[PDB]
């Protein structure tokens, strides 16, 4: 199934995924297409940050759902 | 020193991201009031983020000295030797609000957080070479705004809702037509009473193979009209927003420092909250001076903005008094103080 990801410039990319794909798998597909290391990616969907170890089906992410990719500005 | 009337939060080194978030949420008065109503009587104080938030808010409301957050830090569980000490403020916001939202389910304050922060958008897709179209409605609790090449918030919203082409390696899967060139656009359906905007001040730099911060100039206004980005406007409730908070990051992707500028009452009287020190400042110091583009100033700029809808301001920023804090919670907190 094809989902959408909004990139760090606000452009929409497609990703081919399965409901059983984990968030880590999705981040790896983003790396393959956009080059962003997975350990820096964060994915937002419906106000929730998606968690490693869970699957797309866990969040009811379906064809044509849009995930929002962000990084981090760490501070203390 | 100019009276502020507000107390700071202790600087434990790595706490600044959470201190800045806590002030932002504390001065979302309608949320603060709901937090005080959460039924934490049976909560384990060493584990409960909701009780720890109540405690911090109670002390921000009552203490004359900088407030500590040790029990929130411990129960939130982010600053540890296995998970980093420095953190992203928008990440913290997403995780903290989800925790509190869950705790309020089934209580007299259920739904407070989505009522304050959740909006709805729609995405449309139309194929160019076959007759095939779709849409999908989705919720959001904040908006990620692109900044690279954009001069200001208005331009970022213009780009957010602008039609884009899905082609090349990003063709749309149009069911039995397979991959198809298509046009895609997003429109806002509603905008919430409290609008959180995350400025995407970062990018991957292939030249150094790493993520970097974008420190470019990017302007944001005190008054923000958003009706033109809605699919359908309401003549009785224009989407006019008023700037409430500027959460400022200094540093790079991998570390730095956070402060927050607020005008808590929405009246244009600003203060800077830098951990334990709260000081009056001018509008320029909170607004223009956080636009970026000074090439520490060169990497200090706004990261997260909070706007409140003008028609909701008197409710969102309603006064909070001791009448709003349940006696059972007051007694629990004083019990803790006396015990030490």
UniProtKB/Swiss-Prot annotation, chain A:
It is found in: Cytoplasm; Nucleus; Mitochondrion outer membrane. Changing residue 68 to G: Loss of DTX3L-mediated polyubiquitination of histone H3 and H4. Residues 1-76 form the Ubiquitin-like domain. There is a cross-link at residues 6, 11, 27, 29, 33, 48, 63 (Glycyl lysine isopeptide (Lys-Gly) (interchain with G-Cter in ubiquitin)). Transmembrane segments: none annotated. Changing residue 74 to G: No effect on ADP-ribosylation. This is Ubiquitin. The chain holds residues 1 to 76 of 229 of the full protein.
Curated annotation (Swiss-Prot), chain B:
Isoform 1: Phosphorylated. Isoform 2: Not phosphorylated. Isoform 1: Polyneddylated. Isoform 2: Not Polyneddylated. GO terms for molecular function: cysteine-type deubiquitinase activity; cysteine-type endopeptidase activity; deubiquitinase activity; K48-linked deubiquitinase activity; p53 binding. Expressed in neural progenitor cells (at protein level). Widely expressed. Overexpressed in prostate cancer. The active site is at 16 (nucleophile), 257 (proton acceptor). It is found in: Nucleus; Cytoplasm; Nucleus, PML body; Chromosome. One of its GO terms (biological process) is regulation of telomere capping. Induction: Up-regulated in regulatory T-cells (Treg). Down-regulated during neural progenitor cell differentiation. Changing residue 257 to A: Complete loss of activity. Residues 7-310 form the USP domain. Hydrolase that deubiquitinates target proteins such as ARMC5, FOXO4, DEPTOR, KAT5, p53/TP53, MDM2, ERCC6, DNMT1, UHRF1, PTEN, KMT2E/MLL5 and DAXX. Together with DAXX, prevents MDM2 self-ubiquitination and enhances the E3 ligase activity of MDM2 towards p53/TP53, thereby promoting p53/TP53 ubiquitination and proteasomal degradation. Deubiquitinates p53/TP53, preventing degradation of p53/TP53, and enhances p53/TP53-dependent transcription regulation, cell growth repression and apoptosis. Monomer. Homodimer. Part of a complex with DAXX, MDM2, RASSF1 and USP7. Part of a complex with DAXX, MDM2 and USP7. Interacts with MDM2; the interaction is independent of p53/TP53. Interacts with DAXX; the interaction is direct and independent of MDM2 and p53/TP53. Component of a complex composed of KMT2E/MLL5 (isoform 3), OGT (isoform 1) and USP7; the complex stabilizes KMT2E/MLL5, preventing KMT2E/MLL5 ubiquitination and proteasomal-mediated degradation. Interacts (via MATH domain) with KMT2E/MLL5 isoform 3. Interacts with OGT isoform 1. It is linked to Hao-Fountain syndrome: An autosomal dominant neurodevelopmental disorder characterized by global developmental delay, varying degrees of intellectual disability, autism spectrum disorder, poor or absent speech, and mild facial dysmorphism. Most patients develop seizures. Additional variable features include hypotonia, hypogonadism in males, and ocular anomalies. Belongs to the peptidase C19 family. The C-terminus plays a role in its oligomerization. This is Ubiquitin carboxyl-terminal hydrolase 7. It comes from Homo sapiens (Human). The lineage of its organism: Eukaryota, Metazoa, Chordata, Craniata, Vertebrata. The gene is USP7. The chain holds residues 208 to 551 of 1102 of the full protein.
């Amino acid at each position: 199934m094809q989902i959408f990801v909004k990139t760090l410039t606000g452009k929409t990319i497609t990703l081919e995924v399965e409901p059983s794909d984990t968030i880590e798998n999705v981040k790896a597909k983003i790396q393959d297409k956009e080059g962003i290391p997975p350990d820096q990616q964060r994915l937002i969907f419906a106000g929730k940050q998606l968690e490693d170890g869970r699957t797309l089906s866990d969040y009811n992410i379906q064809k044509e759902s849009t995930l929002h990719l962000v990084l981090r500005l760490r501070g203390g | 020193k100019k009276h502020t009337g507000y107390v700071g939060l202790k600087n434990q080194g790595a706490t600044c991201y959470m201190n800045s978030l806590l002030q932002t949420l504390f001065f979302t008065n309608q949320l603060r009031k709901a937090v005080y109503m959460m039924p934490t009587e049976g909560d384990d104080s060493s584990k409960s983020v909701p009780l720890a938030l109540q405690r911090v808010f109670y002390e921000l409301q009552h203490s004359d000295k900088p407030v500590g957050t040790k029990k929130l830090t411990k129960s939130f569980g982010w600053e540890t030797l296995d998970s980093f000490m420095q953190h992203d403020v928008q990440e913290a916001c997403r995780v903290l609000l989800d925790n509190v939202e869950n705790k309020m389910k089934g209580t007299c304050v259920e739904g407070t957080i989505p009522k304050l922060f959740r909006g709805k958008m729609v995405s449309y897709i139309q194929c160019k070479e076959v007759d095939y179209r779709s849409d999908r409605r989705e919720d959001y609790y904040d908006i990620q705004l692109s900044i690279k090449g954009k001069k200001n918030i208005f331009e970022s919203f213009v780009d957010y809702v602008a039609v884009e082409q899905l082609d090349g390696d990003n063709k749309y899967d149009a069911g039995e037509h397979g991959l198809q060139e298509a046009e895609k656009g997003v429109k806002f359906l509603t905008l919430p009473p409290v609008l959180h905007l995350q400025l995407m001040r970062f990018m991957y730099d292939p030249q150094t193979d790493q993520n970097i911060k974008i420190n470019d100039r990017f302007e944001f206004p005190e008054q923000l009209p958003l009706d033109e980005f809605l699919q359908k406007t309401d003549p009785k409730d224009p989407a006019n927003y008023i700037l409430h908070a500027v959460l400022v990051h200094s540093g790079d992707n991998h570390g730095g420092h956070y402060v927050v500028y607020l005008n808590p009452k929405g009246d244009g009287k600003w203060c800077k909250f830098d951990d334990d020190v709260v000081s009056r400042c001018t509008k320029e110091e909170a607004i223009e001076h956080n636009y970026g583009g000074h090439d520490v100033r060169h990497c200090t700029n706004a990261y997260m903005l909070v706007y409140i809808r003008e028609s909701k301001l008197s409710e969102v920023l309603q006064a909070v008094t001791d009448h709003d804090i349940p006696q059972q919670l007051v007694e629990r907190l004083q019990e803790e103080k006396r015990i030490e």
